[PDB]
Design a protein around this ligand. Sequence first.
Ligand code: 62B
Ligand code: K
Ligand code: K
Ligand code: MG
Ligand code: MG
Ligand code: MG
Ligand code: MG
Ligand code: MG
Ligand code: MG
Ligand code: MG
Ligand code: MG
Ligand code: MG
Ligand code: MG
Ligand code: MG
Ligand code: MG
Ligand code: MG
Ligand code: MG
Ligand code: MG
Ligand code: MG
Ligand code: MG
Ligand code: MG
Ligand code: MG
Ligand code: MG
Ligand code: MG
Ligand code: NA
Lengths: 121, 177, 35, 38, 99, 204
Amino acid sequence: MIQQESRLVVADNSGAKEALCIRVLGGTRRRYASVGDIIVVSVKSVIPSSDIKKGAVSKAVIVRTKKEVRRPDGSYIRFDDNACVLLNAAGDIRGSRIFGPVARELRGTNMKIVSLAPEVL
Amino acid sequence: SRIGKLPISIPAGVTVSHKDEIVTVKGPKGELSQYVDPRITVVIEGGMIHLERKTDDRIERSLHGLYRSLINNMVQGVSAGFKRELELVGVGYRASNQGQLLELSLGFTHSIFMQLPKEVTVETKSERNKNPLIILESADKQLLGQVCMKIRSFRKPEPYKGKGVKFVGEQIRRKSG
Amino acid sequence: GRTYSKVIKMVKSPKTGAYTFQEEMVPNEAVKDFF
Amino acid sequence: MKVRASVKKRTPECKIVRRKGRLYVINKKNPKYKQRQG
Amino acid sequence: HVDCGDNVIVINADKIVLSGNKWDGRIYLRHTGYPGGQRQFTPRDFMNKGPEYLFRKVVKGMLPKNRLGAKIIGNLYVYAGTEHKHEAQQPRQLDINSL
Amino acid sequence: PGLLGKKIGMTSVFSAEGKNLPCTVIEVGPCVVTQVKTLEKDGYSALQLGFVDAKEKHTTKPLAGHFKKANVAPKRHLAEFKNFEGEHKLGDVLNVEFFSDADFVDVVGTSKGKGFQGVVKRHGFGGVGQATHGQHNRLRAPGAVGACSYPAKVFKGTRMAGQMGNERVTVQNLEVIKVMPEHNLLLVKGSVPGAKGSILLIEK
RNA sequence: AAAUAAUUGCUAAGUUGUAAACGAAGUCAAGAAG
RNA sequence: GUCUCAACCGCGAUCUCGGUGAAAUUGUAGUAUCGGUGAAGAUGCCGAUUACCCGCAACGGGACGAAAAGACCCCGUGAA
RNA sequence: GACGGAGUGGUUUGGCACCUGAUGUCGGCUCGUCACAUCCUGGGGCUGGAGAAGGUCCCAAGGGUUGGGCUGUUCGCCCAUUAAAGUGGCACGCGAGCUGGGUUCAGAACGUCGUGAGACAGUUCGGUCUCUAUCUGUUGUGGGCGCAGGAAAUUUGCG
RNA sequence: AUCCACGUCUGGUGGAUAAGUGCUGAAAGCAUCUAAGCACGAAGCCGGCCUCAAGAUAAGAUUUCCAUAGGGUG
Ligand SMILES: C=C[C@]1(C)C[C@@H](OC(=O)CS[C@@H]2CC[C@@H](N)C[C@H]2O)[C@]2(C)[C@H](C)CC[C@]3(CCC(=O)[C@H]32)[C@@H](C)[C@@H]1O
Ligand SMILES: [K+]
Ligand SMILES: [K+]
Ligand SMILES: [Mg+2]
Ligand SMILES: [Mg+2]
Ligand SMILES: [Mg+2]
Ligand SMILES: [Mg+2]
Ligand SMILES: [Mg+2]
Ligand SMILES: [Mg+2]
Ligand SMILES: [Mg+2]
Ligand SMILES: [Mg+2]
Ligand SMILES: [Mg+2]
Ligand SMILES: [Mg+2]
Ligand SMILES: [Mg+2]
Ligand SMILES: [Mg+2]
Ligand SMILES: [Mg+2]
Ligand SMILES: [Mg+2]
Ligand SMILES: [Mg+2]
Ligand SMILES: [Mg+2]
Ligand SMILES: [Mg+2]
Ligand SMILES: [Mg+2]
Ligand SMILES: [Mg+2]
Ligand SMILES: [Mg+2]
Ligand SMILES: [Mg+2]
Ligand code: NA
């Protein structure tokens, strides 16, 4: 349950560390974004001597949420934080490593995250 | 009218009648019945059809010529018939009929299947390296004209190439690209 | 592709008497039922 | 088709017809000269 | 100020004649009372309901707009066919063309 | 066509495909045909059904003569359904197997009664202003009810406070999960209007 | 309230019974050139 | 919980019953709607339309609603 | 599409001064309702329409038509979206429904004008928004009588 | 438990037409979708979906009871 002005942890080695959601894509009054959704962010803080800059505007994909996610088999999953991964203009990710677990929802959206994540759910 | 003051020479082996405001022509190709308005009168004499009107008003001046032509179209309909040739143009366009069923492949994803009445017989002479030809015959000008333009409406000819469904040798609006 | 086909037949109408136009889109293996 | 308060022929092959109380200019050879509302 | 007229029975009312382009050319207007609630209907729309729905509307409007007029409109009976049931009242025959 | 039922409650079940499904349990009990209505007599064709057994102490004499004519045990609820297929006569008995060929059903019920409710809950009004920033006493107010001297009135159909709920409601295309002829039980996916124990019409 | 009055034409637009420059001339009457 | 975007809970007010019992306001009223008309924005005029008789709760569009002989503006051979 | 010409409307700025012992005013909030001169979605004619993408005109008001930064703002500029982020009327709709940032009281200060009291094609900080709903209107909910004898149920649907 | 959304389930389904397209066809020997006829043609109109609805004073219909039927107060 992420909306405009929410702050997320950046969960890849792209250089960015904290991001602010500017927009939830895909609808006129689409209020919330869940795992596997695409958002537009501004980078709020970075590691010293990184590639991307503080204040850049980027697309990202959500990989973890605090609000529990429902599965068709009657199970739920929630995480301790909200996290995303930055994407480039061509739809691919801008980093190499993913830090922390990712949800199984991305098995239907982006196989690059799932292949190089320490654990799925 | 000039048109409506003309006799129609009733050909060999067709019979004409008049009963209850209805003019009926019978011949080899069938029978056609056409209502005629009580203020335009016809009399069958000597095997000829003559029309006349009393008042020279415009509501009869229009009807006089109209009813001469409707009968003149009926008499030639039941004796000789009426010819129309459709020619599909553009590669990948095929026509073929089985019985009265018509099959048309005009470029869409689907196919087209049309059943015609016994008034309009169907035939299709489609040679190789040559365009398919659709031939329709009937005794009714109005109905055969109705069917002919429904088939052409599926694919109207375009200007940029002569592609589409056209009457045989029909003058086509062309336009370079 | 090859998931439907167009079928047309003309039936006389009681309101007027002249032939109307009946149209549908049925799967390719169903036109023999319609005609 | 264009709609004008005054419709003329504008071409030798144009003809003016009345269709249900309204005037039209029709031209099969060159449809760019079609008009309405005579 | 008194109801002194004659009770009238109209028969063959389905063969009434309207001239011109009036059957589907004469627009009636009414309002439901809700915003955007104006509606249109024609004399042919009434004929579908029945002759007694066109005649009643037309005869109304030619009558006084008061309590007495509301009473006397009930003295009118309109029928489609030639068949009615008032033989106990012994209705008289009148040639309307004689009026 | 359809039958009368009683809402029992909700539960969740696992399907064979392995999905968790919310289901509503309805007792579509035995219904007797209590009156046949025909064209030539009534103006239309329909069947009147009776559902819940009633004691004689609770049946008035006019209704007693109604069931005695049909030669059936008196019932508590009566309803009409149309467009059957099979020409059932007086005193016939219908049951849950009627729906054994049904894929989806419609359920008509009466919703729970909320009483008198304000515009915020009845119509989802936004409310006037914020909770702070100079708000005095119009937090759950409707706001303006019309324009000025023209109109000079409130239009019909204006949304206001009033009674909410306790009204007939229809829910369409409910997927049938299972029919249990042993207990006169029907299982449908989803929720239906009304409280437990309420009377429902199930249309095939 | 008082003529479904008498007689002769025009209008087909419900025009009527209480706007123009500019089009097409829908129709009726009387002419002109040729 | 300022908001997205509201939900629920407690008491006091509120509602019903018993007791006591004001006020502002008030030419007379059996006080509907629409368009027109009009001292030029009509419950009350005209032509239509709709409406069985009588309450209670709830909301404020109109009665150019109430209150205060407009402070603005101008005027007075006014005043301070 | 120049030079010119004929109209329609009354949402701008004006002209007139006809209503007014008081007819509350900008912007926003809430709640809408109507028009169509249509922003999207639907249907078409023409094209200097190859296709794709457009341009222009015609029919069409059923539904829909975003969230932020700045500013009292309307309006605008900008950011990110969306199928689209329409234009207007209704006392520039709506303060006996809200607010009170702006304008327009009494305090004070600057620039400027005046000898001064004071003043402003200006600016700046501060500065009480009253009323228990009679009639009508609207949303809900009852009592009486009627329905050509009285009742218990189930109903058709004018709308 | 109740009440709820941030939850879950369900829903937005032939006729006559507009702009247009035509057939046959004269007035006006040709031309012409129109004058006589006819076939089409929009999220729009009417039906179809949901709810109310006989004070619809034009107050409707059906089944049954009474002439102990049925009610009110509690
Ligand atoms: C006092 C009259 C008011 C409340 C308001 C009035 O505003 C003015 O008088 C602006 S001047 C202002 C007045 C107060 C002075 N202390 C300072 C001075 O600046 C206004 C807006 C109109 C211009 C006149 C008519 C009006 C009724 C309709 C309306 O909209 C009202 C009158 C009749 C209304 O009662
Ligand atoms: K009004
Ligand atoms: K007048
Ligand atoms: Mg309740
Ligand atoms: Mg709120
Ligand atoms: Mg306050
Ligand atoms: Mg408060
Ligand atoms: Mg008289
Ligand atoms: Mg309390
Ligand atoms: Mg008391
Ligand atoms: Mg007025
Ligand atoms: Mg009025
Ligand atoms: Mg006042
Ligand atoms: Mg004074
Ligand atoms: Mg004005
Ligand atoms: Mg006064
Ligand atoms: Mg338009
Ligand atoms: Mg205003
Ligand atoms: Mg106020
Ligand atoms: Mg007000
Ligand atoms: Mg001062
Ligand atoms: Mg302070
Ligand atoms: Mg206040
Ligand atoms: Mg011709
Ligand atoms: Na000085």
